[PDB]
Design a protein around this ligand. Sequence first.
Ligand SMILES: Cc1c(-c2c([C@H](OC(C)(C)C)C(=O)O)n(C)c(=O)c3ccccc23)cc(F)c2c1CCCO2
Ligand SMILES: Cc1c(-c2c([C@H](OC(C)(C)C)C(=O)O)n(C)c(=O)c3ccccc23)cc(F)c2c1CCCO2
Lengths: 131, 131
Amino acid sequence: PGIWQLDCTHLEGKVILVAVHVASGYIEAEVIPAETGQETAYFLLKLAGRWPVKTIHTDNGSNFTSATVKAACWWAGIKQGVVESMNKELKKIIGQVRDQAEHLKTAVQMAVFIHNKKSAGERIVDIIATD
Amino acid sequence: PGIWQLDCTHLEGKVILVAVHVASGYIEAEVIPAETGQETAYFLLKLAGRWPVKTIHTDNGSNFTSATVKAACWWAGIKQGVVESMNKELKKIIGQVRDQAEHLKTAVQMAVFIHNKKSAGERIVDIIATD
Ligand SMILES: Cc1c(-c2c([C@H](OC(C)(C)C)C(=O)O)n(C)c(=O)c3ccccc23)cc(F)c2c1CCCO2
Ligand SMILES: Cc1c(-c2c([C@H](OC(C)(C)C)C(=O)O)n(C)c(=O)c3ccccc23)cc(F)c2c1CCCO2
């Protein structure tokens, strides 16, 4: 309901931060300059401002040890194979549309759109609203 | 239902792109480096990937003339005093929390969170889900 999994993946020497709403498979993603606490914190603030984020999961717990990330979670009131499949599907879609944009970040957002419409977007709206 | 108003506002020599979902008052915002078509286009791709965006309104139509923006609207299938009040409320909240962060962008996302929880976030979930 309020559980999100956040992980970073690397592509073309850039870092893609991927958040998956576990119950629906819905994704939000950003291309970030480096895999740093400051970027993770800022991403969390944005995420928490639009969805009711209760709990964050990750495949790399050390991701969430910086004072900056701890601050974001404190302020927003957050605590610590669906996700694997959603990440798999996203990487595949990026591959499929990559040639249609100059910038990786553009391909990433095209892939997020395709994924969420193919839905995960309808399902998250349903879960948060009925809950 | 699918109508969003996008406008830029300037604060501390930076540019804040503010999108308001007209029916609910819900806001998404980003601090962007410059008031350019490339930034607007990228913002639209992200917005359209998470919400069902049908129509975009603005107080400055010239904002949406670049080939980049036209491309975003084409690809995502988008066409061209609530908004004034929501923008007013956002600027006020940024003012109120500004001293709590180093970076303006951080204050902006704190203000978006406060605004959406004070709700606009619950109402958009309701409108998109029942529609
Ligand atoms: C100050 C701060 C920080 C914080 C920052 C802020 O910048 C980020 C880009 C990391 C979000 C800021 O603008 O102040 N910075 C820059 C820090 O250096 C920092 C150090 C320790 C603890 C928090 C922060 C991080 C947060 F997630 C946060 C807050 C305030 C409440 C909302 O959540
Ligand atoms: C190529 C492109 C462009 C586009 C780009 C892209 O970069 C942005 C940062 C502007 C999103 C890109 O990565 O290719 N660029 C860089 C252009 O120079 C451009 C020029 C004319 C028309 C579209 C674009 C803009 C779009 F909104 C877009 C697309 C493809 C379909 C999805 O929507």
